[PDB]
């Protein structure tokens, strides 16, 4: 067909601009069974979500062990110096990030989602995953369209192509078997891509769809967002970061939402078990 790489060279319109039907809310409007699976799972998440919890903390100085109980999923977006190339808060080198004692708070089986940028972080973030005790198991690419501002809007290090995406590396800790651990993960409900328009200059937020992918995939209710900001505070998550303006976190109260008579797992309905993707009989 058409060569959208050539079209970019000619016009400044990025190839990803011509992917159709990428919107989150409008996704499966024409696909009613897919829409129903997502709707039921989001309802299941909402039913079991803790109220928003958040703590202002200097993560470099903080004793990370003060965050209890253990976490089923951890979302980490340390502010990289490449996001600012207009710095305000402390920027983090990959050495700084690696020193975080993530293994001290991750549950024995759990997942991590690490925003790595688009340069050296793709390699150094993998080293961090090793250090923290995870295996890299997926790579969620946030692909940015420039429909509003064609089209050569670049450039940072020793790159040779224009970098139009960011990578969120996913890691697994512990043993998780898709055949037996359907009470912990719902695999294959989302794809490893997010497609949105390039944010306004100086807006460093990541797409909220990353939360949907994490929440759909892991049934663990104990969810930590490190380096989250006021605008990312969200039910079902504990948000911790230096730029938070207020704190309401109480480790004992937070833990009580997951202990008896509750579970740290969301559970599942029969309707979702019948809709979600599963392997066939052996």
């Amino acid at each position: 067909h058409n060569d959208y790489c050539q079209h970019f060279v000619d016009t400044g319109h990025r190839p990803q601009n011509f992917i159709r039907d990428v919107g989150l809310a409008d996704r499966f409007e024409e696909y009613p069974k897919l829409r129903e699976l997502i709707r039921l799972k989001d309802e299941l998440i909402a039913k079991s979500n803790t109220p928003p919890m958040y703590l202002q903390a200097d993560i470099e100085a903080f004793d990370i062990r003060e965050l209890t109980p253990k976490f089923d999923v951890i979302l980490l977006e340390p502010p990289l110096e490449e996001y600012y190339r207009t710095a305000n808060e402390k920027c983090w080198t990959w050495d700084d990030i690696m020193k975080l004692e993530i293994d001290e708070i991750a549950a024995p089986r759990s997942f991590i989602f690490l925003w790595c940028g688009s340069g050296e972080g793709l390699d150094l973030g993998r080293v961090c995953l090793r250090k923290w005790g995870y295996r890299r198991c997926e790579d969620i690419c946030w692909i940015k369209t420039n429909k509003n501002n064609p089209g050569k809007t670049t450039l940072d290090p020793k790159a040779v192509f224009q970098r139009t995406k960011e990578h969120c590396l996913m890691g697994i800790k512990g043993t998780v078997k898709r055949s037996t651990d359907g009470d912990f993960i719902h695999a294959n409900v989302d794809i490893d891509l997010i497609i949105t328009e390039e944010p306004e200059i100086g807006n460093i937020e990541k797409p909220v769809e990353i939360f949907h992918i994490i929440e759909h995939f892991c049934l663990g209710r104990r969810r930590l967002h490190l380096f989250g900001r006021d605008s990312t505070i969200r039910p079902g998550w504990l948000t911790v970061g230096p730029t938070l303006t207020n704190s309401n976190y109480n480790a004992e109260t937070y833990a009580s939402y997951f202990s008896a008579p509750n579970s740290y797992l969301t559970g599942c309905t029969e309707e979702i078990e019948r809709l979600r993707p599963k392997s066939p009989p052996p």
């Binding site: 790489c5 992917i19 224009q162 139009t164 995406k165 891509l193 497609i195 993707p277």
Partner: protein
């Protein structure tokens, strides 16, 4: 300078006869620790590929998937490259939409193929920043990677000799020498390469070297 190719077993061909290339590209049959309907190369066979002799200054495009995201990085290192970009091919259907269904990955479904970009030495005469690092194209016929990558490489490094390992008949084209076991015989045009091929294989049989 027109299309050139050599049908061969990549592990056995004495690649020292082809000279130096500004771009090397390989889409190898990685052992991804999964069941596959085609033959693979072991990790050790991949590591021992004589990539270093193909190039002193230039670029490597290495398609990777699964556990080869990390093994491909290790090969880049062993072969003397630093990774400076990562291209993804976003696969679309006939309506230019992402196919989101099926079970196409171990944990999440998979909508792209990755290509590591490595640099070696100190190349000159390249045009940085002409293309994006995202390719959008439908899956066509037998293609394992999108044909768009050849135009990106040619815009990056126009007029230079390039070499492709594990290539297929569809991939032969001007400025490239294509190596792979599915190619039809041997077709060399560069008189320098022809001369060295004859000296090394006096009767045309590219067999495993006499250990």
């Amino acid at each position: 300078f027109p299309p050139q190719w050599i049908c061969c077993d990549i592990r056995y061909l004495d690649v020292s006869i082809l000279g130096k290339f500004a771009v090397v590209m390989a889409d190898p049959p990685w052992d991804i620790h999964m069941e596959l309907p085609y033959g693979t190369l072991t990790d050790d066979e991949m590591r021992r590929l004589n990539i270093p002799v193909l190039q002193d200054d230039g670029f490597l495009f290495l398609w990777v998937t699964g556990r080869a995201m990390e093994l491909g990085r290790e090969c880049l290192n062993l072969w003397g490259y630093e990774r400076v970009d990562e291209i993804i091919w976003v696969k679309t259907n006939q309506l230019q939409r992402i196919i989101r269904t099926g079970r196409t990955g171990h944990w999440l479904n998979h909508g792209k193929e990755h290509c590591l970009v490595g640099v070696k030495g100190n190349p000159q005469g390249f045009n940085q920043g002409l293309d994006c690092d995202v390719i959008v194209a439908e899956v066509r016929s037998t293609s394992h990677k999108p044909d768009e990558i050849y135009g990106m490489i040619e815009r990056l490094s126009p007029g230079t000799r390039k070499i492709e390992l594990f290539g297929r008949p569809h991939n032969v084209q001007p400025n490239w020498i294509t190596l792979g076991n599915q190619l039809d015989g041997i077709h060399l045009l560069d008189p320098d390469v022809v001369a060295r091929f004859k000296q090394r294989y006096p009767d045309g049989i590219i067999s495993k070297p006499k250990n």
